[PDB]
Paper text:
Acid sphingomyelinase (ASMase, ASM, SMPD1) is an enzyme found in lysosomes and in the extracellular space where it catalyses the conversion of sphingomyelin, a major component of membranes, into ceramide and phosphocholine. ASMase consists of an N-terminal saposin domain and a C-terminal catalytic domain. To gain insight into the molecular mechanism of ASMase function and the interplay between its domains, we determined crystal structures of the full-length protein from mouse that reveal a conformational flexibility of the saposin domain. In one conformation, the saposin domain adopts a globular closed form independent of the catalytic domain, while in the other conformation, it assumes an open V-shaped fold that establishes an extended interface with the catalytic domain.
As observed with other saposins, ASMasesap adopts either a closed or open conformation depending on environmental conditions. In the absence of membranes, closed ASMasesap decoupled from ASMasecat would predominate and render the enzyme inactive. To further these efforts, we determined the structure of ASMase bound to a known high-affinity inhibitor, 1-aminodecylidene bis-phosphonic acid (AbPA; half-maximal inhibitory concentration 20 nM)24.
Numbering used by the authors: 82 to 163, 169 to 609
Write the structure that this text describes.
């Protein structure tokens, strides 16, 4: 026991964790925290110096606490004095024995799938403004001007906490020629910018109509299959389950999507889309595309306080779609915005259980939301050792934060009977702002890398990505590459030390939220 109250403990972790974000050592930061404790009379210094001694005696205990923040660490140290359970009904049909997808045979075609996510169009982006304003979003009207001649916001964007003007997005679509042709496109939400404090419903629908028409303009007859992001509504993250009716429901948003996305989605899809913002359709024989609204898994969605149990019956709906694909022989692609690893515990554990059951039917999982080049591996529930699926977390088109613009393209097993529809390889394209915003610089999108090439993989199967993680656990050079691509070729100046490495690698193995057992082989 420590004579340390709940708010008191939060002041220390604040002054420490904020300090540990760039300060070289713990000692100097430890002194600041003790001085804070003294100046404000927050607690007895013996207790304060005892807490600093524990918060990070070594980085290991804190390596587990890499996720932990003040409220999260205090609860564990103080106790209870400082989210419901539920699960899904799986059909009684016995699980087919696991068998890997057969590699494509000679002559089997390939298909290219463009993947767009996190475009975050800022209607108010303005060149020359201050990229480091006080607001959560800058490079826009109201952020001010730079101080004493410092460089303002770049023309095509900036490496800061800023989003993109329409110019950079129009430039992205126009230069897709070399990346295609595309059989279809996946678009996992987050269309508006991060100007939350001034997002009316008119603004959000303006971003939907404006970007939808733009995408449709440069893709033309190619179908685009979108998924609902967490910024698409106002207030942000607020997606009430369909049991809420009236002007406070998300119908203003869902009925606007069904109208804007009608060219791409069939009747049955729009039906569910209007109700809960999710749908399922058949884009080609043998394949079933399922678009999930991961806002109903979101931690920021305050609406789930009413009933966080499978909101909208989506997972139960997902199970039915998956089980029907299994009986039919089809394979499944799931698209969403928030990756399952970032979901609420119950929702995530149930999704993890669903993916484990239908491993032979699932051929691809695609998400975004992280804005960086990541991937989440799923393991068998019985032993948590056989990688059986992969969720590719594509990088954002926007710069938010301190990143290069970029999109993703997937090579999948082609459109033919018996195909596995699995991802065979993928590529990432970027816009190099340092060259585009420079005097005389012109937009030129280039292929950053191809996965199988840089990583030397035999394929894009779960076992290969599983083997790529532990190769990076022991190969500092192979991880730096991944770390370089992680940020779309614009890493932070802060090198990723051995605690950062294992933390990043632990994210690659944690497709289930709150499961430390998934990273037991990292130290
Ligand atoms: C956890 O910390 C608690 C707070 O710690 C303080 O806060 C930090 C920021 C620093 O300032 C640090 O130095 C402090 O210690 C701490 O709470 C303290 O606990 C002690 C005893 O456990 C309390 O002592 C008692 O105080 C009362 C009130 O004192 C004054 O008021 C009355 C009238 O209201 C007057 O009559 C008194 O003369 C005082 O002017 C006293 O009444 C009481 O004395 C009586 O009882 C004792 C024995 O019980 C007899 O010897 C006396 O003769 C009296 O009969 C105590 O002296 C202290 O008030 C309390 N302070 C605060 C701010 O809460 C706590 O002890 C720590 N907990 C643990 C588990 O360590
Ligand atoms: C909470 O909702 C669950 C989930 O069902 C959906 O929730 C609402 C949106 C509501 O409008 C229903 O029409 C939806 O179907 C309710 O039922 C649970 O359903 C899930 C599977 O989808 C299952 O895991 C649970 O065991 C079910 N529980 C029950 C009691 O049927 C449930 O009615 C709501 N529970 C609470 C406590 O609010
Ligand atoms: C959630 O948890 C368990 C899964 O192990 C389920 O317990 C079964 O409950 C159903 C009724 O819904 C019964 O048919 C089964 O007989 C129960 N268990 C066994 C071993 O028979 C539970 O039903 C699951 N489902 C839900 C909706 O929570
Ligand atoms: C429906 O709900 C909206 C949600 O905000 C109500 O609020 C108005 O609309 C915008 C967003 O669309 C808000 O930013 C404003 O605060 C509100 N309007 C104004 C002029 O400030 C809206 O009033 C509701 N609509 C109806 C018709 O009742
Ligand atoms: C984007 O373009 C910039 C500018 O051409 C590249 O930055 C250079 O990187 C080399 C690497 O050794 C440095 O020596 C130069 O000083 C950098 N130039 C500037 C102006 O900073 C950058 O490498 C390019 N990024 C990608 C992903 O292609
Ligand atoms: C250099 C690595 C850091 C990248 C920055 C990531 C920002 C994340 C944005 C959000 N997840 P999204 O909902 O906009 O996707 P948010 O929830 O923070 O808004
Ligand atoms: Zn985003
Ligand atoms: Zn998002």
């Amino acid at each position: 026991k420590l004579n340390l109250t709940c708010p008191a403990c939060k002041v220390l972790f604040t002054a420490l964790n904020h300090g540990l974000k760039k300060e070289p050592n713990v000692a100097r930061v430890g002194s600041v925290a003790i001085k804070i404790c003294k100046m404000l009379n927050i607690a007895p210094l013996d207790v304060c110096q005892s807490a600093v001694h524990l918060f990070e005696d070594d980085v290991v205990e804190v390596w587990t606490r890499s996720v932990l923040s003040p409220s999260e660490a205090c609860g564990l140290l103080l106790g209870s004095s400082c989210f419901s359970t539920w699960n899904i009904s799986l059909p009684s049909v016995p699980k087919p024995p696991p068998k890997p997808p057969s590699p494509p045979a000679p002559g089997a075609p390939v298909s290219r799938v463009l993947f767009l996510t996190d475009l975050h169009w800022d209607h108010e982006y303005l060149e020359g403004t201050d990229p480091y304003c006080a607001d959560p979003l800058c490079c826009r009207r109201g952020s001010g001007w730079p101080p004493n001649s410092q460089k303002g916001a770049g023309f095509w964007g900036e490496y800061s906490k800023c989003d993109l003007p329409l110019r950079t997005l129009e430039s992205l679509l126009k230069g897709l020629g070399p990346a295609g042709p595309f059989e279809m496109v996946y678009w996992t939400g987050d269309i508006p910018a991060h100007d939350v404090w001034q997002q009316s419903r008119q603004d959000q629908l303006r971003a939907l109509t404006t970007i939808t028409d733009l995408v449709r303009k440069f893709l033309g007859p190619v179908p685009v299959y979108p998924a609902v992001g967490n910024h698409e509504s106002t207030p942000v993250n607020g997606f009430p389950p369909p049991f809420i009716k009236g002007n406070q429901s998300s119908q203003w948003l869902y009925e606007a999507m069904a109208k804007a996305w009608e060219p791409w989605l069939p009747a049955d899809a729009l039906h569910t889309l209007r109700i809960g913002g999710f749908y399922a359709l058949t884009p080609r024989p043998g394949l079933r595309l399922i678009s999930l609204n991961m806002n109903f898994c979101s931690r920021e969605n305050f609406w789930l306080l009413i009933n966080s149990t499978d909101p909208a019956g989506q997972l139960q709906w997902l199970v039915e779609e998956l089980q029907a694909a299994e009986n039919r022989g089809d394979k499944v692609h799931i698209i969403g915005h928030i990756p399952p690893g970032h979901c609420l515990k119950s929702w995530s554990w149930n999704y993890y259980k669903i993916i484990a059951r239908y491993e032979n039917t699932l051929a691809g999982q695609f998400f975004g939301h992280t804005h960086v080049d990541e991937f989440e591996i799923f393991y068998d529930e019985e032993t948590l050792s056989r990688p059986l699926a992969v969720a590719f977390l594509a990088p954002s088109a926007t710069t938010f934060i301190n990143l290069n613009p970029g999109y993703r393209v997937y090579q999948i097993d082609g459109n033919y009977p018996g195909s596995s529809h699995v991802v065979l390889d993928h590529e990432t394209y970027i816009l190099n702002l340092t060259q585009a915003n420079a005097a005389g610089g012109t937009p030129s999108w280039k292929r950053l890398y191809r996965a199988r090439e840089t990583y030397g993989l035999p394929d894009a199967m779960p076992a290969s990505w599983h083997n790529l993680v532990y190769r990076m656990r022991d190969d500092e050079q192979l991880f730096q590459t991944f770390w370089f691509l992680y940020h779309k070729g614009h890493p932070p100046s802060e090198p990723c030390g051995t605690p950062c490495r294992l933390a990043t690698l632990c994210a690659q193995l944690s497709a289930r939220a709150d499961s430390p057992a998934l990273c037991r082989h990292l130290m």
